[PDB]
Curated annotation (Swiss-Prot):
Protein's job: Probably plays a role in ribosome assembly or function; overexpression suppresses cold-sensitive growth of a bipA deletion. May be involved in resolution of branched DNA intermediates that result from template switching in postreplication gaps. Binds DNA at Holliday junctions. May be involved in the correct segregation of nucleoids. Has ATPase activity, binds DNA non-sequence specifically; the presence of DNA does not change the ATPase activity.
UniProt protein name: ATP-binding protein Uup
Null mutant phenotype: Increase in the frequency of precise transposon excision. No visible growth phenotype at 37 or 18 degrees Celsius. A double bipA-uup deletion does not grow at 18 degrees Celsius, i.e. the uup deletion exacerbates the bipA deletion. Deletion leads to an increase in DNA crossing over, DNA repeat deletion and DNA repeat expansion; double uup-radD deletion increases the phenotypes. Although single uup deleted cells replicate normally, they are filamentous and lack defined nucleoids, again exacerbated by a radD deletion. A double deletion with priB is disadvantageous to cells.
Full-sequence portion shown in this chain: 551 to 635 of 635
Organism: Escherichia coli (strain K12)
Similarity comment text for this entry: Belongs to the ABC transporter superfamily. ABCF family. Uup subfamily.
Length: 85
């Protein structure tokens, strides 16, 4: 009892240090990833491939954008946390 962390050391942890420092690279990764996938799916010749090829790219495409935005608000969370914790 009363050994809690009352936001004494919570503004960042090392695990967030390496989280926040790699995450930007990951953002542009996933953005370029989405970019790279959306341009495949952009062409009508894309859906000329078998379902197992196309859905591979389609699913990976949708995963890229979702990963990106979620990682982005994770990033801004870590940024905000680093400023106020």
């Amino acid at each position: 009892k009363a050994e809690t962390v009352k936001r004494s050391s919570s503004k960042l942890s090392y695990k967030l240090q390496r989280e926040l420092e790699q995450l930007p690279q990951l953002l542009e990764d996933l953005e370029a990833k989405l970019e790279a996938l959306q341009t495949q799916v952009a062409d009508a010749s894309f859906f000329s491939q078998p379902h197992e090829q196309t859905q591979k790219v389609l699913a990976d495409m949708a995963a890229a954008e979702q990963e990106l935005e979620q990682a982005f608000e994770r990033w801004e969370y870590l940024e905000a946390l680093k400023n106020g914790g």
